[model samples]
Target: DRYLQDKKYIEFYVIVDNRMYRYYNNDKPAIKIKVYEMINAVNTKFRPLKIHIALIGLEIWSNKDKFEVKPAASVTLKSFGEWRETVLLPRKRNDNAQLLTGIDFNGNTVGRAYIGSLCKTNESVAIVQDYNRRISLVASTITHELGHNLGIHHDKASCICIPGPCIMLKKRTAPAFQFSSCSIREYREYLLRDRPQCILNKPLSTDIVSPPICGNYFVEVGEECDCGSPQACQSACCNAATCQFKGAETECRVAKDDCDLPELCTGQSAECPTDSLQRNGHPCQNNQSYCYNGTCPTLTNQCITLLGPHFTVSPKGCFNLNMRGDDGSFCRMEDGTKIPCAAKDVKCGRLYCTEKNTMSCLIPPNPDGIMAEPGTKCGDGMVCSKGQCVDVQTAY
Candidate 1:
């Protein structure tokens, strides 16, 4: 009866090429804003599957080309792939990176990406050549490209779209808003099997981008709570029509970890405290981790982040299995250079997890899927500082 759904988060980085920047009159702010609008429309189109795509980064090549971005789709795709793997991925980690270009390819090609490239290192990338078209059409192209990434192939006449041929037509020559029923089936099948794992974590409130809207289901900085869209929301504490709290007596913010303090709703204009972190160096997560910036960052914490609550840090044998510097490895130096792992700090690099039960059908989209940050504690006196396991007496 239902689509068999769960909440999955995707943090996508949009890189606008130089020509595209020029199309927006070389204005960075407007280009970013348009990018957000386009992305939000994509989320709307994808609302059926309950997968929320949030923007984490945007790069506008204003002055010069970061790499060769041109009319040839194949060459540009490879060039951007290399650029992302070499330059961008080292600095910023994301579930997917999309290149929004202005240069049109031959045959009026609009987009390109590998099929089923969801969690791939370099292949989880997309190229969309935006034309001077309406935002919805452009969003259709972006959505179609990502559909390919999620293993939704082109649709034939027999597809159960029932809505103007749907988004995955062999030729997107029709006005399309709804995905083919087969497209939904494809997405559901792919997620349950591959479990991409990167899309499982919810973005932090700080990770929420600006110009925040209320009904997006992300409790952003300015909003007291974001239950859901107006019609779909059902929270007694939150007003679905407006992203505000019910009353001052409501628990607006609860302590997430040992270092975070709880707060009640101000009963006025969806307000919560700007600062919520308590004193540092307090034991959290059962003394296994210390508070850092209001959150407990530790191995078990990341295990839950990557997988689910029923999962925990894997045994040493499994952790050591990932110590190899290959496809299954987790060792990386600061700036994301791959290195061999040492037993001294295997737990600090990339996280490996063991689950209580089999992984669920829900896929994940964590910002840094397996990598740990500086604040995560590795040993009693050591924490990962800038990607290295270091003694913590001096740093903190």
Candidate 2:
């Protein structure tokens, strides 16, 4: 499905089984923050997929004294898999919860996760890290392994261009805050081809509003045609931009009826017939009348002509000012809806344009009666307007 607007509700039941520092003993708020950070990374950075992570349950097992372990226990992949399967066996399947097992291992075999092919009904990700590792480090390791279960792979050497360490890379040179381009592309492809149905079929909560999968800018599993936006092209018919039978009359008309084969929709040649004169009383037939936006001009006094597809003119008459200008661009009437400023130097409403030449949403002026100097950086969710840092909601 088109993932951009559609929301995927995923349940991650965290199991922290550690030795020296028990999972239950660890700082829970910090750990939860890390988990959320991982989810944020996956939703926005890994690909344009939206996912909501709910903590349905969490278990922490402190078995150090019983096992008489000084260092953490070493868990082999095979052993870990078996253990996870056993742990998941009695757990209820109705919730479709995936286990994120965080184990404090003695050695440095960080983590592993299941891809689409390796995934099962009760899928799981097992992360193993040293007991003394930093909380953030453990969290990042868990994030990487969880990504594997979500059908992402390690980044290739060629795709490495970001300034810091790669999220998908096994051995990181430093902490990674982003995924490589290759990884992002592969993740999208994987979801498009084989999205885990178990996760998709989960019952949604009342507050959640999931968008249709077709219009989300990705050509997904069941879609026949997808061209970024539904406004650009319909999912049922052939894509106007790429379909081969587009201009052909008979073939293109017939192609509109064809939906069984998606391959036939693209690059097919077509020469469709047109009832140019009969359909509307346009000026091609009547010289005094000109067509504009599908209707023929009714004014007898003005000389009207359809200049091109996007433009039309009836310049001689005074009332013909409604005709479109030569430029293809159409003007949208200004409403309360905020529009992005066209240039970096400009400001729309209370918001300033970004360095990327995009205008942000308006924000209220600052409180405390203190105004910030010009060019001062305003933090997230706050904007500088008229030399003041203000909250977005309060600004209006």
- Which candidate leads the pack in lDDT? 1
**Candidate 2 C-alpha lDDT tens digits along 150-257:** 677877777775687777887764556676777777767777777656555444333222222443333334444444343555333445344323322223223221
- Candidate 1 residues 5-25, lDDT tens each? 568888888888888888888
Evaluate model 2: give its lDDT: 0.41
- Model 1, residue 249: C-alpha shift (Å): 6.8
